[PDB]
Design a protein around this ligand. Structure first.
Ligand code: O9Z
Ligand code: O9Z
Lengths: 809, 809
């Protein structure tokens, strides 16, 4: 059909069809008379998996022969989404499979929809890991993703009576054809026990053993024939475990609970034992595997052969674990073991919000990991000795920098552990990296300025353009070729097309087609009727106070009130779509979801409004829904309070896909506006400096309420029960937070947000100028490719050279 | 190599090799450089599975088209063992695979050893189910095995310090290539709740739902291209289940515990709730599936299209369940629903031992299955009304026959439910069936004499001859052809060879080869050194008081004492091998294992004994060990107290494989001796009538102890600590039971057992006459083919005609 989807050759097609029918018969044990669409999906998945195998075997082979430095990306989260379409894209099989399936009388797009998302992450951090794996494969790095194969990923979200309800995400019920179990590489992980000191060193004894069984998933690079590995551990009980009889067998569950379920908190730390178990489990199994590989190539060369990247502090125990192995098992002296550890490990920080910081109570570590605690204290002592020598007399510095926090309960600051034990610490956007150096890690920065770097986040243009937006991919490719898909900076060439009538027509056409398709998807799957001619105003991301969905709610209510005041006046019609999950125990986040739906109930059913204003809560926001809605968006809402959103990646996805951004100077928004030019971005609100000025004098929300009549009216509607006539006090908690306890200064930005929203509507009245600005955005979106990010990691942290050379087929 | 293993054609072999290499690459994702023997096993398993698929699809297809009466064998146990070799045998692929693997440089026999047993049963009952599936497929019956896919089968048995230790049988760790998950046929099963009565009948409401997900395993018939289905249910939680968050997900375990583990009791009832859950779970899912199939062909024709065979009372709830569906859901009147139920259901009884009888407390049924209880009471009332009309005034009869037993706790007699709700009740050997009519079911028999039948047990000559003893299979086939493998009566033709010098030579040679192979297997796997020239005296079966392993121990100790008395006298050398599992909570059974090993410690280490007497406990007796040891045996020990062993099947396996039997007139032993002639069997001990005479006057063990000096010496050795020098009182419980509380009258049979054992040794001194008697045994073993058994079931219970006609390939 379209060119970027590749060739459908006669041979190729015939072959895919034969293999499809072979899998249906032999793999699925079905004839064409009893097969369901699910069987068909499975037959196709196996057929495509077949094309990976040789490449996967050869790539792993090639790494053994060449022995390059290996990158180990340790994450508790990999937010992969669906694998089928991504695999086809990367193997150039898409058109061939479309053709092959078509000829069997099947719609490939209908089959694609049957695949469960691998929702093994919460949000930005987990998706960053996924984009990274794609880029690392595309850049020919010998890189391995290591995590946990959770039986249950992020919960499926249902709305009932406007409230979020959580359901178990049983993504493995029907089987996963993409993974290969490797039981022969099963490893023991130890817990509990106690430490004996002997003649020749400390001994960790009387432990409980859980086994870690690995599952490997192929990670194909873009058309280079590279297939890297994602290795995820599953917990299994040993067979002597517990071993009246029945109960002992049933108690095997206790041990396997470790890999059972993803904790569904985004930027929130919950200090539960099961969570620490997961953190140690992935670290212990991963490090044994790393060391085993290494010895099949003296520890002096370890950092020349191994890089370990820590995705947040979740795998911070890799630092004490590597020490434990080097010192207790391999019998290296402390100082050498330490040198090796620091040169191997690097730490990526993802947020400055205090409630996200991992601070583990000591009593927990004491019981579960007694040896690791001793090692942590030893690290703390030696670290503080270095600090005291550098800053003699500065006792306050000593307590601020300690890995151990005194207080009610003593805790370990895992972020402090990470900085101490890493040769590099990076934030995830320039402004975030600056804030790390100015504020929370200032002391660490003054001690070791060389450790601190920036690596601005990115997204893969494979999933986030070619895959989800083939029509845009194609019109770009018509003008400038296909090379940009693995070299996104090439999009700058689109700037010479900003005054091309045909290209303007194409850009707008693709946007319109995307909106029609999405509007249809809404009606089919969720019986809702949206005007496709309206401006699509979308905020999709986890529900959070800092992300300020509430600010969007205030704008929505304002438009509503303006319409009612003057019903017979023109306004640019909008569909406001808001979507995301709240963490199950985050009450405020759950109230915001309810507020959103309650506004919809009023707005969507008002006859005077008509199709001028629609408010839709998009249920079950996940990767596969992002792929649908992001291409359909006109306006991206990126409206976190300045200094709170470390980077964001949603922002970049929308820039790439032809939406304009309304946002604060926060996270990568600053770099996006810099790349596109401020005149091509809808910037509003306090800067970082403004927020600090307001904090110095104190944030009084009442001042805003007293001075802005439009705002007062909204707060009164909320309070009086305009939005909740049966429970008039439903939203008392919300009004109250906004008036008395708003950490995120919603009111402070309200006035500038509304004015800036008026400028958006004004530009939308002028399609040509809208589209011209869109082009300026897409054309400058190159920096935000994860290819750029990973090449920066490779060169400035890992000490490896990326490559775009094909392995042989 | 050998003829019964089939042709290895050039095409066949080439083809298997291609498919083997295809699976290694594509299925297992391995090159020949990294593959382990386990990978090789898996590649072969997939390759053989491929040959089943078309046949499986066509057979299921054929049953839909022809719509024959369907047989549903409901068992909580299917003791399948390994599948690979059995599949090859039934598809005639064995030599071809041997050749194909050989050419790849692999030993097929080494690969076969890597397969886990599917140990989804305890002993006789579970193995009977497996043999039946084989026969039903071989006789072209449209038959389905229905059970539970336990995650853990019968525990792996280790001996430590002579004691049994249990380990979890994690048979699914590496995957099962033989099963196909069918998630699309998932069904709800309900538990708990309460009953509302309405205008239109009773309604079971507020239930908890567990899902039943089926896994299908192919059951190939012998060379007829028939492949039937074994469908096993796995328990899965619904996704709204429990749905703070984490705990709700972790609690999904509660529901899935149902299919987690096989209860390891043989002929023992344990009234645990989890066990009742399993019983209902398999019944509820099975019946929905049966009815669904039926409606895709009015309930008047149900029994013309459906037979349900109940393997013991374990699935007795099928009777109230079928009523519940017919009455509550389908709205049939009681009497019609009942007629349908009786005409559909048939009950096989497996034992008369009182501790095996399922008697479920009412409070348990009340809570878990309140509707089923009401239906059971309704059945009871109507049944007792029929009894009162037939036997007016006989109040005692009424209480004896009640389905409900009064007492401490009220209980339901599930066996009574089965007789009431079945058109046929069979025992499992002639003498057992007679005892059912004379004793425990006399009342039921007097009411409905037409219900009571015999169906003498059998074993499949595929697994139990061709597969485990190819060398015997071959020399038989040399004289009489291959037809006997599916028509075992043909073995009678061997009687014309009883005076053939060559055939005598062959029989003895094969026995000798089997003993060499087994003796080697002992050294390799368990570092033990046995004289292959000795008589192999084997007792393999579950450890039980009724099976009288202790009687064997007494004989062993007697030979020991005789040798010591007169060291310099000739005795026929013996290896006594005893093996089997004790139920984990059966203290006595566990003490017997320890006694066995303690005798070995004394006997095997006595220099004066030499290699004249060896005592070996065979660890982890299971199906795949039976396949090795049974062909190697000279003497089969079948020595249960008369009237206790309903049938036995071990007895038949050994008769088929060239061992002579020493046994009591118990179970099928009576029919075996009748088939072979008593002169060709070593019969000893009390008959049934003798046991009854002894019970009438009282069993005084002391009388035996006082009159038999040889016996007194043994009891004194036991007591004084001859066998346990460090714990002198170790065996106090055993001496005590033997002296004061022996239900099984070990002493009563001791004297006759020893004399009869002397006759065995005497015949063994004469190889030619030994072998001639062996031939008379093999030659008359035809009746004990499960083909005979199933043809009897088909004709006299199910109302279907067996067939030996090939389906097209
Ligand atoms: O997931 C959560 C996130 C947040 C949060 C608040 C404010 C920030 F700035 C950042 C995160 O708070 C919580 C409070 C709870 O009691 C339970 C929760 O699950 C959360
Ligand atoms: O598995 C068992 C079998 C028997 C048994 C005894 C005598 C017979 F005649 C038959 C069976 O007794 C038991 C007693 C227990 O306390 C626990 C057990 O697990 C068992």
């Amino acid at each position: 059909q379209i060119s970027v989807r590749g060739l459908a050759g006669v041979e190729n097609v015939t072959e895919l069809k034969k293999n499809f029918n072979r899998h249906l018969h032999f793999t699925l044990v079905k004839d064409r008379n009893v097969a369901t669409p699910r069987d068909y999906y499975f037959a196709l998945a196996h057929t495509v998996r077949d094309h990976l195998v040789g490449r996967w075997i050869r790539t792993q082979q090639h790494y053994y022969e060449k022995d390059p430095k290996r990158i180990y990306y340790l994450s508790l989260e990999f937010y992969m989404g669906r694998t089928l379409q991504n695999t086809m894209v990367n193997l150039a099989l898409e058109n061939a499979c479309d053709e092959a399936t078509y000829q069997l009388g099947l719609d490939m797009e209908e089959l694609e929809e049957i695949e469960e998302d691998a929702g093994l992450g919460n949000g930005g951090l987990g998706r960053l890991a996924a984009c990274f794996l794609d880029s690392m494969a595309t850049l020919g790095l010998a890189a391995y993703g290591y995590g946990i194969r959770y039986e249950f990923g992020i919960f499926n979200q249902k709305i009932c009576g406007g409230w979020q309800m959580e359901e178990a995400d049983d993504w493995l019920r029907y089987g996963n054809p993409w993974e290969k179990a490797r039981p022969e590489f099963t490893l023991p992980v130890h817990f509990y026990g106690r430490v004996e000191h002997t003649s020749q060193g400390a001994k960790w004894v009387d432990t409980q053993v859980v086994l870690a069984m690995p599952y490997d998933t192929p990670v194909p690079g873009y058309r280079n024939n590279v297939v890297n590995t994602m290795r995820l551990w599953s917990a299994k009980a040993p067979n002597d475990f517990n071993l009246g009889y029945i109960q002992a067998v049933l108690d095997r569950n206790l041990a396997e609970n470790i890999s059972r379920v993803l904790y569904p908190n985004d930027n929130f730390f919950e200090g539960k034992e099961l969570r620490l178990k997961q953190e140690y489990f992935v670290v212990a199994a991963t490090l044994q595997d790393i060391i085993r590989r290494f010895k099949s190539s003296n520890f002096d060369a370890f950092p020349d052969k191994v890089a370990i990247q820590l995705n947040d502090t979740h795998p911070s125990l890799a630092i004490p674990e590597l020490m434990r192995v080097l010192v207790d098992l391999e019998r290296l002296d402390w100082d050498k073991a330490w040198e090796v550890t620091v040169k191997t490990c690097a730490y990526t920080n993802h947020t400055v919000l205090p409630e996200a910081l991992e601070r583990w109570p000591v009593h927990l570590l004491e019981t579960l990991l007694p040896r690791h605690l001793q090692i942590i204290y030893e690290i703390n002592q030696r670290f503080l000795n270095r600090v005291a020598a550098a800053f003699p007399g500065d006792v306050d510095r000593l307590r601020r920098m300690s890995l151990v926090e005194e207080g009610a309960v003593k805790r370990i600051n895992m972020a402090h552990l990470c900085i101490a034990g890493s040769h590099a610490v990076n934030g995830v956007a320039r402004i975030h990296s600056e804030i790390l150096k100015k504020t929370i890690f200032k002391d660490f920065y003054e001690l070791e300025p060389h450790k601190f770097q920036n690596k601005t986040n990115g997204i893969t243009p494979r999933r986030w353009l070619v895959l989800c937006n083939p029509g845009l991919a194609e019109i770009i490719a018509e003008r400038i070729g296909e090379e940009y898909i693995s070299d996104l900076d090439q999009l700058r060439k689109l700037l010479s097309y900003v005054d091309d009538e045909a290209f303007i027509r194409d850009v707008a056409k693709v946007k319109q087609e995307n909106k029609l398709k999405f509007a249809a998807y809404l009606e089919r799957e969720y019986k809702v009727h949206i005007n496709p001619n309206s401006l699509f105003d979308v905020q999709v991301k986890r529900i959070h106070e800092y992300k300020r969905q509430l600010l969007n709610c205030l704008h929505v209510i304002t438009l509503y009130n303006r319409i009612k005041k003057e019903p017979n006046k023109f306004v640019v019609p909008r569909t406001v779509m808001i979507g995301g999950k709240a963490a199950p125990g985050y009450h405020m986040a759950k109230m915001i979801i309810k507020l959103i739906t309650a506004i919809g109930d009023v707005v969507n059913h008002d006859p005077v409004v008509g199709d001028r204003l629609r408010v839709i809560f998009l249920e079950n926001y996940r990767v596969s829904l992002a792929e649908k809605v992001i291409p359909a968006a006109d306006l991206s809402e990126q409206i976190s309070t300045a200094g709170t959103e470390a980077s964001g990646t949603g922002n970049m996805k929308f820039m790439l896909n032809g939406a304009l951004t309304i946002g604060t100077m926060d996270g990568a928004n600053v770099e996006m506006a810099e790349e596109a030019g401020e005149e091509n971005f809808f910037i509003f609100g306090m800067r970082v400096e403004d927020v600090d000025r307001l904090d110095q004098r104190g944030y009084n929300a009442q001042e805003y309420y007293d001075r802005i009549p439009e705002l007062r009216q909204i707060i009164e509607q909320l309070s009086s029960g305009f939005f909740s006539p049966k429970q008039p006090d439903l939203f008392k908690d919300i009004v109250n937070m906004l008036m008395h306890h708003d950490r995120f200064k919603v009111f402070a930005d309200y006035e500038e947000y509304v004015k800036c929203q008026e400028r958006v509507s004004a530009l939308y009245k002028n399609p040509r100028e809208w589209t011209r600005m869109v082009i300026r955005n897409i054309a400058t979106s190159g920096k935000f490719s994860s290819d750029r990010t990973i090449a920066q990691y490779a060169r400035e942290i890992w000490g490896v050279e990326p490559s775009r050379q094909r392995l042989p087929a």
